[PDB]
Amino acid sequence: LSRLDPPEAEVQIDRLITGRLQSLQTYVTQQLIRAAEIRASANLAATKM
């Protein structure tokens, strides 16, 4: 923001924000997959109990 003027800083911040949002989406998707796996594991554990 300090070293670039608003026009180009806009697209630079848009690049950064797209990257970070995609990274967070990937993290949450992997977390959902792991949560489904752990749900299956917990169901098996309850059946065993």
Place this chain on the structure above:
Amino acid sequence: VYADSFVIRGNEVSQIAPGQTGNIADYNYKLPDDFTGCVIAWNSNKLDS
């Protein structure tokens, strides 16, 4: 529709645009970042010089 008129130097016309920096764009006439419209300029040496 709003029509704003004025006279400036030749290369100084480059400051007439959204989000620009300079004497004019900062202390005389600043266009908004979301400006939609047109900027029309023509030489006036036969009139104002």
